Amino acid sequence: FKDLNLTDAQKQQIREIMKGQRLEERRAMHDIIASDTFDKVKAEAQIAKMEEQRKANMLALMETQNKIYNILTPEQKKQFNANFEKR
Amino acid sequence: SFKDLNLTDAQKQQIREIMKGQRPLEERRAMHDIIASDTFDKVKAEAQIAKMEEQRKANMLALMETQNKIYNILTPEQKKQFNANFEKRL
Numbered sequence: 700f701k702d703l704n705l706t707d708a709q710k711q712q713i714r715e716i717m718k719g720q721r722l723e724e725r726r727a728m729h730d731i732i733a734s735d736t737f738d739k740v741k742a743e744a745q746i747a748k749m750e751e752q753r754k755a756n757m758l759a760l761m762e763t764q765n766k767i768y769n770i771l772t773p774e775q776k777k778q779f780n781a782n783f784e785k786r
Numbered sequence: 787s788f789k790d791l792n793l794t795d796a797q798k799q800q801i802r803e804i805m806k807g808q809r810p811l812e813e814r815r816a817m818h819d820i821i822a823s824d825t826f827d828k829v830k831a832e833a834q835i836a837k838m839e840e841q842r843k844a845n846m847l848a849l850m851e852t853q854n855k856i857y858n859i860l861t862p863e864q865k866k867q868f869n870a871n872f873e874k875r876l
């Protein structure tokens with residue numbers, strides 16, 4: 700949600716930023732959870748594998764937000780930053 | 787949804803015992819710095835993302851072990867319900 704007063708040109712720019720963005724993991728988790736015994740080495744392997752997808756996801760998320768920040772006016776950026784503190 | 791499984795009295799005590807270990811904004815502030823810049827610095831971002839790898843590992847190991855311990859006190863009918871629920875979850 701946004702109390703930023705986005706102009707229609709800005710909302711268009713944003714929608715375009717989002718579209719430019721563009722289970723196996725959970726399955727492995729499931730097997731760790733459902734096992735008779737807890738296998739720490741196997742869990743560590745799954746955690747490490749998960750770091751790769753987290754990296755990809757956090758990079759897309761940050762880049763997207765940065766792109767949005769930089770189409771805002773100075774007044775809109777203040778509000779964005781204030782909102783960021785509140786989450 | 788472990789609460790959703792009609793836990794027996796004994797299971798609630800066992801969980802209580804298990805859930806004993808079972809146990810941060812500086813990362814947020816760094817994210818904020820990356821986002822509110824007039825360029826996106828992928829190298830700085832990558833470093834930010836990597837910084838709490840060890841803490842993430844420790845926390846996830848604890849969570850996975852705890853969830854494995856709880857799964858194993860379940861009855862066969864409770865396990866079926868847990869697994870079916872699992873197949874529908876983010």
Ligand SMILES: [Cl-]
Pocket residue numbers: 725726729872873
């Ligand atoms: Cl699954």
Ligand SMILES: [Cl-]
Pocket residue numbers: none
């Ligand atoms: Cl099965």
Ligand SMILES: [Zn+2]
Pocket residue numbers: 715
């Ligand atoms: Zn266009």
Ligand SMILES: [Zn+2]
Pocket residue numbers: 725726729872873
């Ligand atoms: Zn599954």
Ligand SMILES: [Zn+2]
Pocket residue numbers: 726727729730
């Ligand atoms: Zn499997």
Ligand SMILES: [Zn+2]
Pocket residue numbers: 735
């Ligand atoms: Zn078995």
Ligand SMILES: [Zn+2]
Pocket residue numbers: 739740
């Ligand atoms: Zn070992």
Ligand SMILES: [Zn+2]
Pocket residue numbers: 751754
């Ligand atoms: Zn990579």
Ligand SMILES: [Zn+2]
Pocket residue numbers: 799800803
């Ligand atoms: Zn006990």
Ligand SMILES: [Zn+2]
Pocket residue numbers: 815
């Ligand atoms: Zn600080």
Ligand SMILES: [Zn+2]
Pocket residue numbers: 824825
């Ligand atoms: Zn500059």
Ligand SMILES: [Zn+2]
Pocket residue numbers: 836839
């Ligand atoms: Zn590392």
Ligand SMILES: [Zn+2]
Pocket residue numbers: 732849850851852853854
């Ligand atoms: Zn688990």
Ligand SMILES: [Zn+2]
Pocket residue numbers: 869
């Ligand atoms: Zn299955």
